[PDB]
Amino acid sequence: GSHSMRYFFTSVSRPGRGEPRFIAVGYVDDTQFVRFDSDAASQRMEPRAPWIEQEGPEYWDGETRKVKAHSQTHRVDLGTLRGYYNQSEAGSHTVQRMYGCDVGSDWRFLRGYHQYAYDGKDYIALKEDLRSWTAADMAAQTTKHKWEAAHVAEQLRAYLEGTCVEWLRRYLENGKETLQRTDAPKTHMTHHAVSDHEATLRCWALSFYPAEITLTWQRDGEDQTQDTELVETRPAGDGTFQKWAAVVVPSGQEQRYTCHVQHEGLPKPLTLRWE
């Protein structure tokens, strides 16, 4: 179906402890493929998926060049923002930036994004039309006007609609066996006695890709949303994901409960019951 490429950048000032930390990561869908860490030894963009490793030296030199430029930009931006908000020189602050593109099932442009945050909240973002900006506060209205007059939207729009989508297409085909796979969850239920009169039913989904999944419990076909223990979807470490959902059941009531699993990889949604 749909696919995405996203870059995520984090810059953290360290007053009286040297240069700000800068970390950049790239993803296609739920798979990381590159990284840069200002505190690492290489000072280069580095591969994090096997399928990007076969890009040649011109790729890696070019990506290293651009990410150091991103790094320098952000170094400068931390100072600008400290002034804007009249903050002391001594405190650690955070800038985050995210951009990339979505393609549809036709692998043609679907949506573009470019978002910017300061200390954990919205600062400025490119709107959906990729032609205008949303400034979160009064400081960001200054940036909005600066960026309008320098035509920053125009430059990003050409990237997000053109080159971003072209590279996404190339990564998808070069990493076909990683990126164009769907791994259906392996599912099962566990039963454990909380006491003589109560037991936990835990419904498991394991080793699935992509991360998008829905796990729910019903009792006699009624939603148990407010009485289900649901964990956040979590990485297994091997590029697959995990999720579980548990309910507490009065003993004797096991057959009343059903766990329901929806995932891209299942031909049909599953309904699991204990005995």
């Binding site: 790729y59 990506e63 991103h70 400068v76 931006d77 951009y99 920053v152 430059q155 990237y159």
Partner: peptide, 10 residues
């Protein structure tokens, strides 16, 4: 591939 022309706030 990264954007080639990332601009400062100022």
């Amino acid at each position: 591939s990264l954007f080639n022309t990332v601009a400062t706030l100022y």
